Ligand binder design. Structure first.
Ligand code: NI
Ligand code: NI
Lengths: 79, 79
């Protein structure tokens, strides 16, 4: 990346998410984005709090992003 | 992993998917699973063909798996 933690700490979660996708180049579940973003800002996802519904909204507003129909799967023994 | 390509080539896609999740330990979009599985069998995803709706079905049948509500996102410039 071309951003420090301190630059990331100045960005909208949706601009962080955008650089992740440009690096990663893979679709990602919303919750995994939250984790990768929260780890790049060295906080706990829990702490993003009020920026979460903001982020969900921005992703929907901003034309660069698609919500894909593709189904997220996992193991029952993680929940 | 503890499987060769040749052992994987004998397994139901759903047992391959299960070992992926046990390694990876992350939720994954269905289509990314198809890619990781297709690359572990050195074929093109396209070639899994009739095993695809089989796999979708097995995931739904088999109690180890959850379909999570979490939304898959991506960039419009991949589609
Ligand atoms: Ni959008
Ligand atoms: Ni199931």
């Amino acid at each position: 990346k071309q951003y420090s933690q301190e630059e990331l700490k100045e960005m909208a979660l949706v601009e962080i998410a955008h650089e992740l996708f440009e690096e990663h180049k893979k679709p990602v579940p919303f919750q995994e984005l939250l984790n990768e973003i929260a780890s790049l800002l060295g906080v706990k996802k829990e702490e993003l709090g009020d920026r979460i519904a903001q982020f969900y909204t921005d992703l929907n507003i901003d034309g660069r992003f698609l919500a894909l129909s593709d189904q997220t799967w996992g193991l029952r023994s993680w929940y």
